Design a binder for these strands. Structure first.
Ligand SMILES: [Mg+2]
Ligand SMILES: [Mg+2]
Ligand SMILES: [Mg+2]
Ligand SMILES: [Mg+2]
Ligand SMILES: [Mg+2]
Ligand SMILES: [Mg+2]
Ligand SMILES: [Mg+2]
Ligand SMILES: [Mg+2]
Ligand SMILES: [Mg+2]
Ligand SMILES: [Mg+2]
Ligand SMILES: [Mg+2]
Ligand SMILES: [Mg+2]
Ligand SMILES: [Mg+2]
Ligand SMILES: [Mg+2]
Ligand SMILES: [Mg+2]
Ligand SMILES: [Mg+2]
Ligand SMILES: [Mg+2]
Ligand SMILES: [Mg+2]
Ligand SMILES: [Mg+2]
Ligand SMILES: [Mg+2]
Ligand SMILES: [Mg+2]
Ligand SMILES: [Mg+2]
Ligand SMILES: [Mg+2]
Ligand SMILES: [Mg+2]
Ligand SMILES: [Mg+2]
Ligand SMILES: [Mg+2]
Ligand SMILES: [Mg+2]
Ligand SMILES: [Mg+2]
Ligand SMILES: [Mg+2]
Ligand SMILES: [Mg+2]
Ligand SMILES: [Mg+2]
Ligand SMILES: [Mg+2]
Ligand SMILES: [Mg+2]
Ligand SMILES: [Mg+2]
Ligand SMILES: [Mg+2]
Ligand SMILES: [Mg+2]
Ligand SMILES: [Mg+2]
Ligand SMILES: [Mg+2]
Ligand SMILES: [Mg+2]
Ligand SMILES: [Mg+2]
Ligand SMILES: [Mg+2]
Ligand SMILES: [Mg+2]
Ligand SMILES: [Mg+2]
Ligand SMILES: [Mg+2]
Ligand SMILES: [Mg+2]
Ligand SMILES: [Mg+2]
Ligand SMILES: [Mg+2]
Ligand SMILES: [Mg+2]
Ligand SMILES: [Mg+2]
Ligand SMILES: [Mg+2]
Ligand SMILES: [Mg+2]
Ligand SMILES: [Mg+2]
Ligand SMILES: [Mg+2]
Ligand SMILES: [Mg+2]
Ligand SMILES: [Mg+2]
Ligand SMILES: [Mg+2]
Ligand SMILES: [Mg+2]
Ligand SMILES: [Mg+2]
Ligand SMILES: [Mg+2]
Ligand SMILES: [Mg+2]
Ligand SMILES: [Mg+2]
Ligand SMILES: [Mg+2]
Ligand SMILES: [Mg+2]
Ligand SMILES: [Mg+2]
Ligand SMILES: [Mg+2]
Ligand SMILES: [Mg+2]
Ligand SMILES: [Mg+2]
Ligand SMILES: [Mg+2]
Ligand SMILES: [Mg+2]
Ligand SMILES: [Mg+2]
Ligand SMILES: [Mg+2]
Ligand SMILES: [Mg+2]
Ligand SMILES: [Mg+2]
Ligand SMILES: [Mg+2]
Ligand SMILES: [Mg+2]
Ligand SMILES: [Mg+2]
Ligand SMILES: [Mg+2]
Ligand SMILES: [Mg+2]
Ligand SMILES: [Mg+2]
Ligand SMILES: [Mg+2]
Ligand SMILES: [Mg+2]
Ligand SMILES: [Mg+2]
Ligand SMILES: [Mg+2]
Ligand SMILES: [Mg+2]
Ligand SMILES: [Mg+2]
Ligand SMILES: [Mg+2]
Ligand SMILES: [Mg+2]
Ligand SMILES: [Mg+2]
Ligand SMILES: [Mg+2]
Ligand SMILES: [Mg+2]
Ligand SMILES: [Mg+2]
Ligand SMILES: [Mg+2]
Ligand SMILES: [Zn+2]
Ligand SMILES: [Zn+2]
Lengths: 53, 181, 154, 123, 141, 110, 69
RNA sequence: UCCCCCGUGCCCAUAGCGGCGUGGAACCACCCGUUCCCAUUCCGAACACGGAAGUGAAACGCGCCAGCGCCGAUGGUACUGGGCGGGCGACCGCCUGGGAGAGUAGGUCGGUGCGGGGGA
RNA sequence: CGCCUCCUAAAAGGUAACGGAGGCGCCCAAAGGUCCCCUCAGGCGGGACGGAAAUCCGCCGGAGAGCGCAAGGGUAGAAGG
RNA sequence: CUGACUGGGGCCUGUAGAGCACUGAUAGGGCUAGGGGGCCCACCAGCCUACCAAACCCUGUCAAACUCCGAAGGGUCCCAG
């Protein structure tokens, strides 16, 4: 981790629950991360969006 | 395939003269042209522009074949060169497109070189291939001074199956390569 | 050339017992035989100082055989500077490699030669600081072949 | 690349255009045209392709031009330098050749000034 | 004085000193040699002293071969310090030398010139020595 | 010194043999196509087929599918059902693919 | 050959200044040139141009022997 | 059962480099083409497809050669488990069991399983 | 002053000193997954600008290149592109 | 009855010793890219080195953090006392 390499949560875009923790380099990757990930609540894969940790 | 004067000349004129000049026992022993590789090592277009386009568009007119970019293997400070910068165009001419370009290279291009006094006999590979260098791209008939923007030259590699320089020089002179000495 | 040396067969005597008994453990071999031998140390000394791996030594084994050998190896005890084993190469007609001396009419004292045991010369003569020539320009009497690359300076 | 190996500039009259060839001054431009029936006033842009080759053929065959002229000029300088005649030493060290004094100007032949320090006064 | 031009590591752990010399036990170049009878760390200064002694006896003549090289860094702490605080600084170089090693050879000289020169040299050495002459045992190696 | 051909052939064969299955190895010449199902633990070919043995001719692809069915036909006879396909140096395409499609059509499991 | 990335080679007529014609293929249907290989002074055998000299300088500086014999 | 070829393993250079000789009926390759499938940061070179006029030139297969590479004894030595001595030391020696590396002689231009095509 | 790599370390593991030398407190949205393909460094000869070194061609080349950064191990029958 | 220790058998190891194939060090000689040295040249060459200068070749060596090698032993498992 660092000031430019920030921790972040991934929020299921369909039930709004944060499901994963990870990082990115926000200078190299300014856009919000969007990744398909399995949501335990929706018991199915879903688009997940970065939010502030 | 199709009929190009140089190709038909290679079989009709140059192959029998080669056999009676060297005594080839097998018909595949006699030297053949393999490919023509054209190299514009630009480096002017390192970052100063993507002039590679206007120079590949003209390579595409001269050879009928779209060039491919070459990128810097290593980084070199003195060259102002980061690894991976697009620093040239290379195109591999084979078969009929090789003949058509070689045919025009001899018939119109080399004569259009000013102060031309013949190709260097010493530039043979040591192993039967030949290389020459041109300083202008408008030596070729498809390029006109109005269509140009900056003079760029090239390296031309002609590869043959001849094992020796001696065989290869006979192959290229018989086809019509004016050698200076 | 040439010399003669008594040589006796050994089997299970310790080399330390033989050395302590003033004798020199040794072996005899070629393509066809391999025998453990021993020579008397002082006798070997006076022959080898003259014969010295260039010249033929005929071994007189007690069983009547007079086998012609070339010394091919001498391991020394590095503390005492005394030989402690000898390899006698039994010469037979097949071509061998050996070192032949060089006498000049000065890097290399001798030279490696591929030769038949019949044609084993005593000399290889040279010619006339700092200058030097190479083994390429060399005499080569009948039967002998320069057993190196002639890139050798002499 | 038309005649000889140089493209003589269009939009100008043909007599001045031919001067842009190393080896042809105004007087030689007067010749080639008259000896070939091309109006010296014709703009290069407005010449027949028949007139191109008629102008070109004479020009390139009558006198030696661009590269060969330079090679023969170079050969004579080289010759003067090789034998060691006084003109040959001039072309070597880069000083004038035709009697001009060098204490002052000669700058065309010497190049930019190389200012050095001078002798001094007494205070 | 001799010493390595470059080195991977500045400081070596101290040797052991067992066993007859590993190699260099036969005269290789000259006619006469000087042989070590005991082991020792021979310093570069000892070598340079044995060498000059043989030059001033050969009055610039003959050939001198030095077949030991001081490559082992030798470390000493500054005077009066206490133990610890890391290894002392390198103050010199030694050549490990074990019984049987030919340290020096000479040639281009008479037998009397070489025997005396080698005798003087051995007096510069912190060990007992022995003068040898090139034998056939040597040339067979 | 290996060529790209040999490097490729090792590359795909190494991965197949790790799975432990019987290997349906395919060799394709300019004229003929050959198949043999192989036990690498015993080093024994269990069953084979080819245009050369079946003396077939015509469309190389259409013939390739045929040896596939022919190899499968004899394979099911000896109990062999599961198998791993070994395209060796070949792209999974054309003649090799047709032979592969043929073997499945005849009942081999891969 | 890849589709849509190359210029189409077509039969092509090349015209030189010596009335020469060449039948080759190219990207331009008809090209005119000022010089070909059938008339380049190097190609056309010896064709010594303006310079048959060599040189004759200098020992051919005769005219004359008018110092008295 | 034996010979040749093709495919696929195993030993992991005694199997390699180089030099030479040799093979096209079959098999393999190159080859003939680039319509079709598919393919080139450009190129039918590669990958791929459709073919069968030619050539074993390249590649590959099989042989012969020890120049290089690779393998490599026997004998002797170093060292050493255990047992004993010696020297102020640095270090050395004996008994018993074990025993290299280098080098010498020498060997090697592969050997073998399974399947398929062909042959006698 | 915690962590990593090598040595010391006496051919299992472990092993000390204010013993001999270095490194870490990050990074990567691909520098991650999988499928398909490709094979380096360097030597020599050849080639406009072009050099020791840019890009191109031939030959040789088992890995001495590369694998983000220390070191060691590993590795082209890929972990490298 | 499984223990210490011991017999046999398999596997693991990188020390002693040795070696120089890799990483470095290194003595003598030969052949040698960059020169100094320099009768000297710059008109464009050169040319000669009883001197330093990679690579290679021959002779000769050194290494805890070098290894193409490599013991005695040591460890561990099985069977037996
Ligand atoms: Mg990330
Ligand atoms: Mg839950
Ligand atoms: Mg955030
Ligand atoms: Mg013929
Ligand atoms: Mg075309
Ligand atoms: Mg040449
Ligand atoms: Mg043009
Ligand atoms: Mg060739
Ligand atoms: Mg007697
Ligand atoms: Mg004696
Ligand atoms: Mg010998
Ligand atoms: Mg003018
Ligand atoms: Mg004046
Ligand atoms: Mg200590
Ligand atoms: Mg040591
Ligand atoms: Mg001391
Ligand atoms: Mg100390
Ligand atoms: Mg100290
Ligand atoms: Mg300390
Ligand atoms: Mg020693
Ligand atoms: Mg003393
Ligand atoms: Mg004496
Ligand atoms: Mg002696
Ligand atoms: Mg030795
Ligand atoms: Mg059919
Ligand atoms: Mg088929
Ligand atoms: Mg396969
Ligand atoms: Mg007169
Ligand atoms: Mg039967
Ligand atoms: Mg096979
Ligand atoms: Mg087999
Ligand atoms: Mg040979
Ligand atoms: Mg033949
Ligand atoms: Mg062959
Ligand atoms: Mg055939
Ligand atoms: Mg036939
Ligand atoms: Mg199409
Ligand atoms: Mg062949
Ligand atoms: Mg051999
Ligand atoms: Mg071995
Ligand atoms: Mg050995
Ligand atoms: Mg033994
Ligand atoms: Mg001992
Ligand atoms: Mg013992
Ligand atoms: Mg011990
Ligand atoms: Mg014990
Ligand atoms: Mg003991
Ligand atoms: Mg005591
Ligand atoms: Mg003392
Ligand atoms: Mg002892
Ligand atoms: Mg002892
Ligand atoms: Mg013992
Ligand atoms: Mg014993
Ligand atoms: Mg051995
Ligand atoms: Mg022996
Ligand atoms: Mg031998
Ligand atoms: Mg041998
Ligand atoms: Mg043999
Ligand atoms: Mg062999
Ligand atoms: Mg055989
Ligand atoms: Mg086999
Ligand atoms: Mg088997
Ligand atoms: Mg069979
Ligand atoms: Mg049968
Ligand atoms: Mg059969
Ligand atoms: Mg603590
Ligand atoms: Mg910590
Ligand atoms: Mg340990
Ligand atoms: Mg360790
Ligand atoms: Mg443990
Ligand atoms: Mg304690
Ligand atoms: Mg620190
Ligand atoms: Mg992403
Ligand atoms: Mg990574
Ligand atoms: Mg990917
Ligand atoms: Mg070059
Ligand atoms: Mg370049
Ligand atoms: Mg790097
Ligand atoms: Mg770093
Ligand atoms: Mg590596
Ligand atoms: Mg019990
Ligand atoms: Mg137990
Ligand atoms: Mg035990
Ligand atoms: Mg040791
Ligand atoms: Mg070394
Ligand atoms: Mg050592
Ligand atoms: Mg060690
Ligand atoms: Mg071995
Ligand atoms: Mg231990
Ligand atoms: Mg045990
Ligand atoms: Mg055990
Ligand atoms: Mg028990
Ligand atoms: Zn959800
Ligand atoms: Zn013309």
């Amino acid at each position: 981790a660092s000031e430019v390499r920030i921790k972040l949560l991934l929020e299921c875009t369909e039930c709004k629950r944060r499901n994963y923790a990870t990082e990115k380099n926000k200078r190299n990757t300014p856009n919000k991360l969007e990744l398909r990930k399995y949501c335990p609540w929706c018991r199915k894969h879903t688009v997940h969006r970065e939010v502030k940790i | 395939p199709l009929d190009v004067a140089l190709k038909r000349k290679y079989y009709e004129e140059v192959r029998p003269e080669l056999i009676r000049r060297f005594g080839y026992q097998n018909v595949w022993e006699v030297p053949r042209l393999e490919k023509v590789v054209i190299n514009q090592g630009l480096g002017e277009a390192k970052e100063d522009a993507r002039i590679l386009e206007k120079a590949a568009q003209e390579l595409a007119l001269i050879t009928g074949q779209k060039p491919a970019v070459t990128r810097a293997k290593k980084s070199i400070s003195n060259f102002k060169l980061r690894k991976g910068m697009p620093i040239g165009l290379r195109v591999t001419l084979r078969r009929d497109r090789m003949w058509i370009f070689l045919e025009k290279l001899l018939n119109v291009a080399l004569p259009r070189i000013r102060d031309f006094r013949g190709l260097n006999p010493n530039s043979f590979d040591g192993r039967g291939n030949y290389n020459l260098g041109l300083r202008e791209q408008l030596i070729f008939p498809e390029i006109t001074y109005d269509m140009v923007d900056a003079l760029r030259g090239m390296d031309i590699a002609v590869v043959t199956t001849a094992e020796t320089d001696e065989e290869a020089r006979a192959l290229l002179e018989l086809l019509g390569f004016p050698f200076r000495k | 050339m040439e010399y003669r040396l008594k040589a006796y067969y050994r089997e299970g005597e310790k080399p330390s017992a033989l050395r302590r008994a003033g004798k020199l453990p040794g072996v005899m071999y070629n393509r066809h035989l391999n025998r453990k031998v021993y020579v008397d140390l002082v006798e070997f000394d006076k022959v080898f100082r003259q014969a010295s791996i260039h010249h033929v030594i005929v071994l007189e084994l007690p069983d009547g055989q007079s086998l012609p050998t070339l010394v091919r190896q001498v391991n020394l005890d590095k503390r005492r500077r005394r030989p402690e084993h000898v390899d006698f190469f039994v010469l037979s007609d097949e071509p061998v490699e050996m070192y032949v001396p060089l006498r000049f009419v000065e890097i290399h004292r001798d030279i490696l030669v591929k030769v038949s045991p019949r044609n084993i010369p005593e000399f290889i003569e040279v010619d006339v600081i700092g200058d030097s020539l190479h083994a390429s320009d060399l005499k080569l009497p009948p039967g002998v072949e320069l057993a190196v690359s002639p890139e050798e300076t002499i | 690349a038309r005649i000889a190996g140089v493209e003589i500039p269009r939009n100008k009259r043909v007599d001045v255009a031919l001067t842009y060839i190393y080896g042809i001054g105004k007087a030689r431009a007067k010749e080639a045209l008259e000896k070939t029936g091309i109006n010296p006033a014709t703009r290069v842009k407005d010449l027949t392709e028949a007139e191109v080759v008629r102008l070109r053929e004479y020009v390139e065959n009558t006198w030696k031009l661009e590269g060969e002229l330079r090679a023969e000029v170079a050969a004579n300088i080289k010759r003067l330098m090789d034998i060691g005649c006084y003109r040959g030493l001039r072309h070597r060290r880069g000083l004038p050749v035709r009697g001009q004094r060098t204490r002052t100007n000669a700058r065309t032949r010497k190049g930019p000034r190389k200012t050095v320090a001078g002798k001094k006064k007494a205070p | 004085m001799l010493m390595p031009r470059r080195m991977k590591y500045r400081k070596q752990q101290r040797g052991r000193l067992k066993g007859a010399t590993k190699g260099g036990d036969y005269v290789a170049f000259g006619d006469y040699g000087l042989v070590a009878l005991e082991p020792a760390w021979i310093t570069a200064q000892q070598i340079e002293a044995a060498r000059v002694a043989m030059v001033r006896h050969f009055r610039r003549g003959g050939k001198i071969f030095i077949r030991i090289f001081p490559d082992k860094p030798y470390t000493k702490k500054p005077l009066e310090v206490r133990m610890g605080k890391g290894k002392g600084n390198v103050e010199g170089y030694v050549a490990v030398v074990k019984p049987g090693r030919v340290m020096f050879e000479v040639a281009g000289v008479t037998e009397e010139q070489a025997m005396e020169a080698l005798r003087i040299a051995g007096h510069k050495l912190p060990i007992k020595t022995k003068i040898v002459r090139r034998d056939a045992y040597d040339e067979a190696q | 010194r290996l060529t790209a051909y040999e490097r490729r052939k090792f590359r795909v064969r190494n991965r197949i043999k790790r799975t432990g299955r019987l290997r349906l190895s395919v060799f394709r010449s300019l004229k003929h196509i050959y198949a043999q199902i192989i036990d690498d633990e015993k080093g024994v070919t269990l069953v084979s087929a080819s245009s050369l043995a079946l003396k077939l001719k015509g469309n190389k692809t259409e013939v390739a599918r045929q040896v596939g069915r022919a190899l499968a036909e004899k394979a099911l006879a000896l109990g062999i059902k599961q198998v791993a396909f070994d395209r060796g140096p070949y792209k999974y395409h054309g003649r090799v693919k047709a032979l592969a499609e043929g073997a499945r059509e005849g009942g081999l499991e891969f | 050959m890849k589709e849509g990335i190359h210029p189409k080679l077509v039969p092509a007529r090349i015209i030189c200044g010596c009335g020469n014609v060449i039948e080759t293929y190219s990207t331009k249907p008809e090209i005119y040139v000022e010089v070909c290989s059938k008339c380049h002074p190097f190609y056309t055998g010896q064709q010594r141009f303006v310079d048959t000299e060599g040189r004759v300088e200098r020992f051919q500086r005769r005219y004359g022997d008018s110092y008295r014999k």
